[PDB]
Amino acid sequence: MNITVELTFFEPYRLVEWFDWDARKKSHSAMRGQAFAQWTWKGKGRTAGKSFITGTLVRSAVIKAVEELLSLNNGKWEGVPCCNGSFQTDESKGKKPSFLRKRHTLQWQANNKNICDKEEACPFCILLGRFDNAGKVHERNKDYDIHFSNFDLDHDLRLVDIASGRILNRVDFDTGKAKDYFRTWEADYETYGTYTGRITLRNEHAKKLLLASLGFVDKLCGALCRIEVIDHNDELRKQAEVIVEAFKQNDKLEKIRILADAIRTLRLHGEGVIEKDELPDGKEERDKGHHLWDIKVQGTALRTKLKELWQSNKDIGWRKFTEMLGSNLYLIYKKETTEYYSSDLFIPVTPPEGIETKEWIIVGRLKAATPFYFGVQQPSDSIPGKEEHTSFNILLDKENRYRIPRSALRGALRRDLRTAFGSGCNVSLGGQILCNCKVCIEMRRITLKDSVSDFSEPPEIRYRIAKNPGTATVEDGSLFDIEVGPEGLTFPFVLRYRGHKFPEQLSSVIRYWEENDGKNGMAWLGGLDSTGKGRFALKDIKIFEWDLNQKINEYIKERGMRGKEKELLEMGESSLPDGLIPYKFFEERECLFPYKENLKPQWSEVQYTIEVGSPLLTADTISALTEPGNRDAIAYKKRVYNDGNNAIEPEPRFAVKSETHRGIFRTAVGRRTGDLGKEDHEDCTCDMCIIFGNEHESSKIRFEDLELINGNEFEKLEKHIDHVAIDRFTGGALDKAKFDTYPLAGSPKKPLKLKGRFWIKKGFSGDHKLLITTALSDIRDGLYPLGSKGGVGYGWVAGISIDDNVINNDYVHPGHQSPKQDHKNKNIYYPHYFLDSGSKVYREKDIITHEEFTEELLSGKINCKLETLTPLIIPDTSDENGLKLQGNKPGHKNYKFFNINGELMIPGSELRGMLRTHFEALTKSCFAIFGEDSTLSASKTLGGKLDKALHPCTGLSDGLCPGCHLFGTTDYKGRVKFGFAKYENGPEWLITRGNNPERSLTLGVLESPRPAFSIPDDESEIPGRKFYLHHNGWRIIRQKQLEIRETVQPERNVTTEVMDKGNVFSFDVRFENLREWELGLLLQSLDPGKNIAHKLGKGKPYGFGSVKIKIDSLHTFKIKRVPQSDIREYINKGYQKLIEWSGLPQWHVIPHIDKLYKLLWVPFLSKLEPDVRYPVLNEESKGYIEGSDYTYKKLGDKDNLPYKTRVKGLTTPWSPWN
RNA sequence: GACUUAAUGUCACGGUACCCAAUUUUCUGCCCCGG
Ligand SMILES: [Mg+2]
Ligand SMILES: [Zn+2]
Ligand SMILES: [Zn+2]
Ligand SMILES: [Zn+2]
Ligand SMILES: [Zn+2]
C-alpha cells in the first residue's frame, strides 16, 4: 500500500552530483554530499540532468525524527509502546549499511510487552525495516514492509537553471582567517524546491507514527523542510574583447578595468544614462572630449558604442547587460594582465524521566547597521556544470535580492557562542565521535534559516587602494573593489533551539546581537569586518516556545512553523498556533553573565566626531564617470537603505570610507612604530600587524564609516573648486591641465562633523591601546588629512571630540638700482621678468620616504599670517556670474572672492603653487610645469627648446628636483601641505565708488602670454621662470575704471571681488620629514625678507596680489614651539645648502637668488611708486601717452633694438623699458 | 516504471569565501602682442 508524499524546501538546499556507492568514494564532494540532494545527468555533455533525493536519505531523516518523537513521548506513540530498536549491524552477520551513524542515538527505556520479531514488532522496529524480506541488497519493491522511493523533482532541466555553485568556508576563531573551503550547489528552492516521492507501507500498525515523522522531519539536503502527504554572454564577451583591443590600440588597458567598474555602476543609473546620453562629456577645453567615454572604438565613440551594445542587448535587462559587460571587461583585463571535504560506535543517550524538551523559535529582523559584504566567487568560476581575483561580487539569489546565507550566519553564531562560553573547539570535519565541547553541543540543537531581503537594487561598489608607504601614492595595480549592500537593510533572522533548557550563553549571544536604546547590535555577519562590513543589529526580536513533551502533535501539525516564520514575526499572540506560546523569561542582558563577562567587553566602542575645517574630497572616481556633470573629482557618497521607508533614501549620505578611516589609522600607527617600512607582512608579530591584522591573522580593530552628520547645516554642501596648472615660463596656464574638484564645503568656523567609530578587541596591550590613542591624537593634531588633495589642503582635521560612552625676518634686500635712483618715477618697467637661471638642476635619487617619521628629519606645523601689500584677487571661478551682472553684459565673466560657507578663504592650492614657484626659483630646480606640446611661429617645440634638466621630473628612477622633492610629483606625494588661508582682520574689500558692486573692481584684459616676444627667433632659448613685479598699477586701473568698462569689450575683461591691501589671512603649512635645511628654505620661501613679498592670484602683471607672509610660530614634533634662534639656524643651514648648490645670511650674494628677490622686491614698502605696465600695441592704441614711444611696434622691430637686448631686458628684473 | 536510492545506523544546520590594501599623487583658475 503506497502513499505519495511531497517535500518542500524553504531555503536553498544543497545539491551534489550523484555517484553510485562504489564510485562515490572517489570524489570528496560526493562523500561530503551523501546527505545532500543528488543530481544525475540525463544525457551526455554534462549540461542537463535530473535532480532527486534518495529514499535512503528521507528514511534516515524519518528514523531520526522517529527517535526524537519516541524520546519526547518516552518510547510510546498514541498508546502502543516501542522498543529501543537496533542500530548495530554485525559484519559477521552481513554487509554493513552504506551510511553508518556517528551521532548519539536517543535510546529510552523499552517497556514493550514482548520482544520484537518477524511475527510481531513495535512501530520502531517496523519502520526501521528490522524484520521484513528486504535487506541490504535490493531485489524487488514488494519485499519492503516500509519502502522509501526516490523523491524526484516536481517541476530538459539544466544544472545552471536549478543550482548555483557556491564556495563555503571554515573560519578559524583564533586567527579570523578561513582554514579551508568547500563547494556546494545551492539549488533554487523557489522554482525547484518541491520533490515528490512514494512511501510504501504494508501494515498499518506503524502508520500514524510515520505521519508523525513526516511532520517532524525539519532538515533534508541542507535546508528547512515541510514534508506533506500528497547567447548574449558570448557576443558580449566578443564585443568586450574588441573594446579591450581598441583600448589597447590607444595603450589605455589600465582604464579598461575602471571602465568595467563604470559599466558595473551603470546598473544603478538605469537605461536612460545611455539612451538619453547622461554620461559626462569631459571638459570643453580639450577637443577630444571625455577621457574614457569618448575613446574611439572601431571608429566610433565609446558612448555610442555602448548605445549600440545596449540596443543590441535590450532582450536582457539593463542590470544584466551592465553586469555581464562589466564582468566580461574585468575578466578580459584580468586575462591580459586549500580545499577540504570531510571506528563505528553505537552511543545510546537516555534523557532522565520528567525532563522537558522544548523548541524555542527566535524570530527577528537582521538590520544592517553597516554596509555588508557576503563574499561569493565570480560567476565565470561559480558555474555548477564545470569545476587571484580583484573584483568581488556580493552574494545574491536568483532574482538579485541580497541574502544572508545560513552558513555565514551559522558560522558567526558559532564564533559568538565560542566567545560566550569560555572554551570552544576548532571544528574537526571527520570525527567519528561527536565533539563534547559546549559550543558543539549547543549548536547541534540550533537551527537557522537562509535569510533573503525583500530589496533587490544593485549593490554599491567599494573601491579600495593600497597606498605605497614610501611615496604615499596609489600602489600600481593594487586597486580592487567589492560589492556592498546598503546599511539599514533588514533580513528575517530565524533561530530554533531544540533542548531541555535554554542556555545562558545563547541568550547572551542573542542579547549581544540585539540593538537597544543604549546598545549597538553586534552581529558581524559576512566578510571584511576589519573595514566594518557586515555588523548587523538584531531587532524586533520575539521568542516563542513549543513545549514538546506535552504539546507535540500540534508541533507536527503546524510543522514547527518552518515555512511561515515571516508570518510568525508580524502576527501577534491572538493568532499564534496551539502549542506555540511566547517566551516570557528570556533573560535580559543586565544579568546574563556570559554577555557581561565575555561578550560585552569583547569589542569596546570608541565613537568620535572629526571636525574638518577644510574642504573634504574623498574622491569617488567611478562616480565621476557615471553621474552627469563635468567634475573630475566628486566626494564619496553611499546608498543607505531606510527600513521605515522600505527603500533607498533619496539623498546619498556623504562619508569618508571605513577603508579610508582604517587606512588612515593604519598608517598613523605604522609610522610611529616604523612597521609601515617593512618590505613584507607575512607571519609578522609587529604592532601594526597585531592591531590591524595581516594576510594570516584578522584585524583586532574594526573601523566604520566616518559619516558626515553636519550635511544638513551647509546651504550648499558640495563646493566647486576648479584648479589649473600654471606654466613656469609663460605666466598663464594650460587649458588641458585644468581640473575641477567637488569636495564637501568645509571651512574653519563652519566645519564638517564626521561621526566615526572603531571597535577594539578585548586583550589589547597597554602599549597597543596607547598606539591607538596616539593614532587618534595624531589625526586630532592634523597630521593626516582625510581624502584627497591633503597637500593641496583638503580634508584637514580641525579636531576630534570623543564621546562620553568611550617672528619676522630681519634681512633687507638692496633691490634694483634704477627704481631707487628714480624718485620721480619717470621710468616704465615691464610687468614681468624672467629669472635667468642656468641649466643646472640638482636631482636627488635618495628620496625621503613617507613610511615613517624619521628622528633626524623634522615634522611639524607652521602658523603663518598673510598680509596683502596691494589688493588681492582670489576669484571663485565656480560661479562665472558670481557678482550677477552677466544679464547687463553677456559673456563678461564675473567672479566672487574665494569663499567656503560665506567666510573668505585663500585655497592652499594657490598658496602651494605660489610657494612651489618660489621654491623652484629659490632652489634652481626644474620647470615642473611646462607647455611641451606648444609650438612657436619654429623648428622645435617649446619643450624641445627647454633644457633637459629643466624638464619636469617624470618618475622616481631618475632624481627629483628640490621643488619636486618638497612639493611632490605624480609618482611621489609632497612633504608640505598648505592649508586654506582663513581671513581674520583687515579692511576686508577694496571699495571703489564707480563700481556697481563696490566690493568689486574690473581690471584690464588678460590675454594669453606670448612666448614669441620672449623667444623671438629659433636661436633664443627659454629665458627662465616668469615673475611679476610688485607695483601699484592697480591704482592706475582704479583711476581709469570708468574708461575700462567701455574701451574694451565685456567678454575680454573680468570684474571680480577684490580684497584690499592690509588684510590678514592665517594659514598652516604642515611640513613632514623635512631636512634641517629644507625647513629653513621653506621658512625663507614664506618670509624672505623685510622688503620681499609674494604674488598670487589674478592680476599679477597689473599690480594685484602683492602679499607678505610672516610666521607667528613653528611647531615641531618628534610637540614643541621652536624659538627664534633655531629658526635662524634652519634658515642659515638652508643658506649653506644654496651655496653648496651654487659652488645673518646675505641672500644677494647668490646671483639667481638676488635676481629672484629683486623680482619680488617691494619698492613701496618708502616714497617709491614706480609705474610699470605693458606697452601698447601701436601708436594708434588706447591708453598711449604721446611722445613716450612705448608702443609694441618699437620693441617688436629688430631695427630699434636687437633681439638679444630684448632677451636681456626680459631677464633683468626692474630693468627700465622706457 | 526507468533515469535514480537501499533500508535493523547520513551530527554535513559538522565548515562565516575568511583574511589582509587611505582612489589617491602631482598642478596658483592664470594671463599682452601681433596679423
Ligand atoms: Mg528491512
Ligand atoms: Zn522493537
Ligand atoms: Zn566542538
Ligand atoms: Zn607587521
Ligand atoms: Zn622637478
Residue numbers in the entry: 6 to 160, 166 to 240, 268 to 374, 387 to 391, 399 to 443, 454 to 872, 899 to 1029, 1391 to 1571, ...
Give excerpts from the publication.
The RNA-targeting type III-E CRISPR-gRAMP effector interacts with a caspase-like protease TPR-CHAT to form the CRISPR-guided caspase complex (Craspase), but their functional mechanism is unknown. A recently characterized type III-E CRISPR-Cas subtype contains a single-protein effector that exhibits specific target RNA cleavage activity with no collateral activity or cell toxicity, representing a promising new tool for manipulating RNA. Lacking the type III signature protein Cas10, the III-E CRISPR loci often contain a gene encoding a caspase-like protease called TPR-CHAT that contains a caspase HetF associated with TPRs (CHAT) domain, which is a caspase family protease typically involved in programmed cell death, fused with a tetratricopeptide repeat (TPR) domain.
The nucleotides at positions −1 to −16 in the 18-nt 5′-repeat tag formed multiple sequence-specific contacts with residues in Csm4 and Csm3, indicating gRAMP recognizes the 5′-repeat tag in a sequence-dependent manner, consistent with the conservation of the 5′-repeat tag sequence. In contrast, we found a series of sequence-nonspecific contacts between the crRNA spacer sequence and Csm3.1, Csm3.2, and Csm5, accounting for the lack of sequence specificity for spacer sequence recognition. Notably, a metal ion was coordinated by the phosphate group of −11U, the side chain of D137, and the carboxyl group of G134 and A139 in the gRAMP complex (blue inset). A magnesium ion critical for guide RNA stabilization is located in a similar position in prokaryotic Argonautes29, suggesting the metal ion observed here may also function in stabilizing the 5′-repeat tag in the gRAMP complex. By contrast, in the type III-E gRAMPcrRNA complex, nucleotides −1C and −2A within the 5′-repeat tag stack with 1C to 3A within the spacer, which are available for base pairing with the self RNA target (red inset), possibly acting as sensors to discriminate self and non-self RNA.
